[PDB]
Nucleic acid binder design. Sequence first.
DNA 1: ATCAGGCATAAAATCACCCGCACAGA
DNA 2: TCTGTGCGGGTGATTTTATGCCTGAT
Lengths: 399, 399, 517, 517
Amino acid sequence: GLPGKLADCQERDPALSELYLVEGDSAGGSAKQGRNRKNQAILPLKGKILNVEKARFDKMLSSQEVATLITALGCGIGRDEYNPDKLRYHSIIIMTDADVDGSHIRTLLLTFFYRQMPEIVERGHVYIAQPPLYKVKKGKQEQYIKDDEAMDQYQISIALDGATLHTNASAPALAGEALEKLVSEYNATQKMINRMERRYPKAMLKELIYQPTLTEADLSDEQTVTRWVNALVSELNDKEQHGSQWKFDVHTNAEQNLFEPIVRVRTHGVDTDYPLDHEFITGGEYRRICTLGEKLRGLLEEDAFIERGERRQPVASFEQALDWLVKESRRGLSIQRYKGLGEMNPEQLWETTMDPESRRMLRVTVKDAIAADQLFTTLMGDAVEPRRAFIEENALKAA
Amino acid sequence: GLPGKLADCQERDPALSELYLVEGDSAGGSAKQGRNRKNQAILPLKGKILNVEKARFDKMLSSQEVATLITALGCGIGRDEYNPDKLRYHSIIIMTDADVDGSHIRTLLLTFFYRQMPEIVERGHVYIAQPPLYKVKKGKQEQYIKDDEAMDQYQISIALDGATLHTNASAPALAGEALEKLVSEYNATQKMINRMERRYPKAMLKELIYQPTLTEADLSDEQTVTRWVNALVSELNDKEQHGSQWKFDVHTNAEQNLFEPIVRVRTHGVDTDYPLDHEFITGGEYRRICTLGEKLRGLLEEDAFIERGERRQPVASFEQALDWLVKESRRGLSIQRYKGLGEMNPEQLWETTMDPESRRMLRVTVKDAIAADQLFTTLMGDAVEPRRAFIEENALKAA
Amino acid sequence: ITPVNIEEELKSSYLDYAMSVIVGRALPDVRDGLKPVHRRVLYAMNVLGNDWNKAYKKSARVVGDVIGKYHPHGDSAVYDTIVRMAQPFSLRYMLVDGQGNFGSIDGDSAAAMRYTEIRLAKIAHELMADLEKETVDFVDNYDGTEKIPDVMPTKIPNLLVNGSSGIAVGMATNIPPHNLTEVINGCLAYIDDEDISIEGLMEHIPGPDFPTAAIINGRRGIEEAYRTGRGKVYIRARAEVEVDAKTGRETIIVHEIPYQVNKARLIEKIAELVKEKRVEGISALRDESDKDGMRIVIEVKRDAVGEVVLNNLYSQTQLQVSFGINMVALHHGQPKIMNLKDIIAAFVRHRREVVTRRTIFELRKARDRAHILEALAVALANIDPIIELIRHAPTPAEAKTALVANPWQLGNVAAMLERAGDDAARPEWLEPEFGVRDGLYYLTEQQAQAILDLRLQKLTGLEHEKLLDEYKELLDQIAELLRILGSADRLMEVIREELELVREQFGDKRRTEITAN
Amino acid sequence: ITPVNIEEELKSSYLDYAMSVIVGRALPDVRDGLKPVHRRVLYAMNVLGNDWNKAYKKSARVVGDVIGKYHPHGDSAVYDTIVRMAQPFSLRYMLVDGQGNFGSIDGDSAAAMRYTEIRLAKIAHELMADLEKETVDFVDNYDGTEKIPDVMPTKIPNLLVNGSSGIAVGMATNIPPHNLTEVINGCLAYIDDEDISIEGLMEHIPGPDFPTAAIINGRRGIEEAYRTGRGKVYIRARAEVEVDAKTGRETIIVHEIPYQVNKARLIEKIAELVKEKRVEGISALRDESDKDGMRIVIEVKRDAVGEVVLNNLYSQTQLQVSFGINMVALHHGQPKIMNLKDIIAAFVRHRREVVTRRTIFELRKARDRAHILEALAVALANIDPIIELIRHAPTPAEAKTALVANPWQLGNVAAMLERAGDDAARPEWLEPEFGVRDGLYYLTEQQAQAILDLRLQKLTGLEHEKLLDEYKELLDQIAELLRILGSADRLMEVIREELELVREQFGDKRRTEITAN
DNA sequence: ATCAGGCATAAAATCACCCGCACAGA
DNA sequence: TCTGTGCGGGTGATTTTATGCCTGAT
Ligand SMILES: O=S(=O)(NC[C@@H]1CC[C@H](c2ccc(-c3cccnc3)cc2)N1)c1cccc2cnccc12
Ligand SMILES: O=S(=O)(NC[C@@H]1CC[C@H](c2ccc(-c3cccnc3)cc2)N1)c1cccc2cnccc12
Ligand SMILES: [Mg+2]
Ligand SMILES: [Mg+2]
């Protein structure tokens, strides 16, 4: 029969009614108070549902949540009673939470529809709702942030609201098109450096930005490369604050006539050597920090200051100026991150997620049928060895 | 059949087996680990049981806890199947908790046995267990205290361990038989005063101990009674710390020729009069504080001190000396009060409650059969008006 | 094995349970209108610093603190009484702000403890006013080491502006809510004349006021409850019948519903009554509430009359309920049935005690501070011998004992010390040996240690005038508190200003209409 | 409505869940052997002051603090991992003391949270040693405003003396417990020679040690697990057959049972096997455990042989189990299968980092304190012009700016200042303009404020020698820390003494016997 | 004339899913 | 050649009693 926890709508015509799938009574109670009563319906769920691929057909029919979901749609299950033209709602919307536990429930809900009712997915009746994640209150104005990249762009734009970088007194300042490009290039290079920490020390790579560049033609002379490596290791001992010792070596080679400097360090009583061979000089990683250092070696003389709106403070480095500019904008700021639909008022959930004039929604489609069911067997199947190799391979791609 | 939560014993002969009734899995788990496995059995209960008097016979048989309790004993219920010689245990022991919620469960358990199985109660098979209430650790020695009166006696005895009351220098001290009698008489008078607070102020009654006594023959002269009431109200203004004003009156009467003083006070801007008539002078309440004041008006001159074990501190009043004697004994003391059987280790529960060589236990009997079932109708019956009059009457007896 | 009788075992056990429920669980006090459950929750929220103008805080912290420190009785019952303070259809004046999902009027339950945020309301700070000035008594915990107040020093008359609902052993209570600006006027009318009758007190307080508006139908049951303590009233919903401009069709619109009435159950009951053929003339039934308010639409057939159908729904459905008034509360530790005049007179007595206990604490604190400032001001006029005596001492203990050995001469402060005449600034415990005798000053052991802890930056010419101004301000504040404690009409003059300020700050309007039959 | 493919929606959602369980829920770290659940519980017990030599505390307070401040994941799962640290049959070295009802070996559950009291054990204070000296990193909460340590600065090698048992997505772990005095000897043998082989490291650590004793039957599966990471061992109970002096009756007595084995289920399984007629020769079965230990009595029939019945129960009942060893742990943020030598070598590196991070903090603190004490000692030799300059100033700000305007002459402290030569006590951030130049001293803004906050009781003749002795002690402590940071053999000499002290304080004996087949 | 329900503080319990690895039973 | 079961750290839900006064349904 009809389920007891289903809150139906007043519309009886299909292709004008919608069904929402939520994650318990906490989200279900907030969704019912802020919906449209004429053509929207809510159905709560009781937690993690059964895995269809790992279970047989006999265990599937005896489950309680699956039977409720089958009798809510009204189309049917199996092959003898699978007329798909008796569907009651022409829009199925999944509105699980924004945690990592909500991502697991969406995976089981997606593998239930594809493995049991494929024609509903092929005819385009399944949607995915997108609630916001951040709420930012800046004094008197509130905004909603979709994802982390929009949060980064928002905090960069609120840091660069007032950008008057004065290189020296009685000189024009830089603002607008130059500061944003410099900040973006510096952030890209700093993001590139943090992925290179597994092979080189972090303090050595940041020193190479302000050092003069080394070309391929300078590797044929001993004096230039030994002067470059001596000037590199001279100031690393000067600015050291954690108690480390730095040395250097020449490493004269006979075949493939070159001279490759060697950097030696001792951190906790352990000595390691980091060679700078021909692969590092001609590589693409040294080119980006060389092009960054062309516009940074210089540009800051004595008596230099920055002003955002009214506050003047002298700086001696670009990093100190950027840190003072970032830290000033985080005074009257409050950031709240949502981890469930029960944390929102019913007025807030309607205006951001369920209003059909100001909402964003996805529509699932199938591209290749042969390549789709091969991925469902690997990730959701009984065997554990292709799953472990699939997880381990994608971890190397990010690093 | 046999219940699943019953932990049976290895003895099959009746009149050598015991059954314990406890209050859940928290007490039941602690009772099973510290029992004697040969001839002791444990049966937990699920909370508050049904009221037998307010419920009909049809609702009683459909209950789950009552059916478990019936099938555990094995005697039977009703009249067709009530052979009472098939009893499996000849000792039924009730071991509920030491809260006020544990006293309610014992009342329902007592009214189940008397109203349904009266021959078991009449033949003497029902007992009541008595776990201890306090655990006192004095430095390196631990003791268990049964009730509040034993706690009061213990703290009085630990306060009066060293009692060297010196009235003056170069004089013998009082110790032993006199200090305990003085402390007991003073505590009895102070307990009598606190029940008299509803009719007289507390500060006025404590002043009458050190005042000279007033006889019946002194009520026939104006000068003596006005001097007595003036000397009474002179020092109440002197020692006042809460901002009150005290006055007096003579109140000359014509018939029944006497002179009764009147005490007037103003506490928070409100004025009240407290007459001291002929009923108060000849009453038994004034006699006790008169006999207390015969041995206290005096006995403390200048340069007086007390010493308990090694500490000498001068005092000017008996109350200050008693307070200093009490407060010195509460330095290395820790008091823990139990509120359930799950707070005790299984080693501690065996040595104090369940060991048949060092335990205390009661045995319920019936004195008058006519007067017993009349009390069960009043307290546990449907009508609410005799119950309200029974509760209100006993509150007046304590005050 | 000492035997006992079954008559005395039953009597001793049942009276211990019955007295604990009456005094310690239900039946709120008459002076603040709170059960012991509510007082510990408000005190624990006050200790944490969960103010009304600060950020929100999760309810799990508050529930954990209440369970772990003050209230050892369960976990789910503590969260149930928090959400009753935050629902606007449950209390007339709410005490908890709340944000998230706290249920609905259709019977929806609240969310879990991990998803909701709470903080104190602005009106809840008036209940705990002047708590840290020794105005109430404190009791121990179940295991010691913590202190809980016995009663709250409230400035707002509770138990009338809100209600009570509890079941005990042998008795129960049921009190309706009222309006704040009317009960404050009644309290002021009691202060102006203590012999005010029930009829003279009822022209300021006409009747109860409910948070869900509606209509009270009748005046006979209100006057009986205010004289005796027991009475019965009737509550009626607000509805009307409207016709169409073109056709003769009629509809029934419901705007308000009575107190403690669910809406979904009412709609289901009306639909069941139509289906079972017990009410005739109804063809449709919807629910279009939206955001502007409440609206329920009932369709009337063409062959029926809309007035008769509306009159049939009053006597069959839950569009008219009954309320049974029964006022019991704890007075001096025992239950008592009270009328309207007893509740008003038990509030002014509490206010008198609170003010006269605050004044003594403030006076003692002021006199101690003035006693310290006198010795601080004396020692700055004798800087060189003080420094010489300190520098010629091996240990600070011998330097402390050398300060009290000799009197110190005055100078440049005699005009200050002569203004504080008639011993108005001396502490009450001070011996007559010390103080100002002749032209010399005698120090104590407490005053000598304050000189040795004086900082080196106090020797400038700026802070001395600050000390003199602080001494002048302390003398004026000492004089005013003695003028308050001297008389009683000044004491009653202080109380009226606070009540008028409360009426000005938290005024409201009447929602419920009182008519006749 | 922007469309998406079902291939990329499935891949993106499943990898976000799988990486969070691996890194943030299960699979403990290799440096301290703790999951993220255990670290927050121990840190919250450390913050409250729940020490081992203080009074007990209720578990409801600890669970409420953990839920409300650090761990937002449920309530019943937090209490389940607390009682696993207190049961003596569950962990080899317990971390929580506990008092009350914490379950039994027969399968009894623990009591509620309102009835049990817990506090830290003495061995748990070695895991959080030197936490407040900047030796580890700190991370944020789920909502900010609180800080949680990233890893613990432990001195005791965990993950070997205790074990691990967790299930992740794609992998799982299973590590047995060991003995403390053997793993400390293996750690010292690694320090003395870094090229020690597996066979040379196995003469100090012969095998696992279980808290329930019993017998390990075989040596082949132990050597395979210490070289590769995977292996299988067998655990056998201890039992014997005894005869009667007069009659020829025989009985079987069981003294010990294997690891993770319930006793009541074992007795029920033996009784069911007798009832179903699959084991012959058993006539009775009891359980007489008492307090001296464990004893299970099985009766043997007269026509049967007691050795054959005992050998039949090993291969049919749960008197012999199997253990599958599989060692995975997080190393630099990624899972890895490890052998015995990798776990030992990852502990000494952690100890090196902790000591060399503690030394820098102590050196900086000592140099700042010496810098303050120099300016405090200088100003006491020029008392009269300091007092004159303070008294002739209107405001303390002008008095502060008047102190740094001119140099101050030395006297009676030049012999003290010349002992701290070669700039060994100067702070690293100090400018070369200030300090001691010629025979004069130059003050800073920080040093000038410390003179203005000097108490008046510091002018006596006692505390000056105390300041000089404190300066001498600070110079010696500065010299020793530089001698530690100078070389590496001194650094390895500091580490060995702590390990020997841990072995002396928390030594034990082996419970499990290792035999051959 | 009898029975059941709904109003606020207190007691006590229990069951269904995802995730890998080894083993007993059928 | 299948089918349950148990180990630990996560998600979600659910029923039965005492005690008083008033109503509706049988
Ligand atoms: O419980 S107290 O003594 N009174 C609450 C009343 C009782 C009944 C009334 C009420 C109950 C339910 C609804 C309701 C339920 C479902 C749907 N539609 C409405 C409405 C009102 N609410 C109390 C609790 C907590 C804090 C209190 C603080 N000062 C006074 C009383 C307090
Ligand atoms: O879960 S942990 O990773 N290992 C516990 C082992 C797993 C299995 C083992 C065990 C389990 C059950 C019994 C048992 C059950 C019933 C009857 N008779 C015995 C015995 C041992 N106990 C862990 C938890 C908490 C704190 C930990 C601290 N340092 C290490 C591991 C810790
Ligand atoms: Mg969720
Ligand atoms: Mg109990």
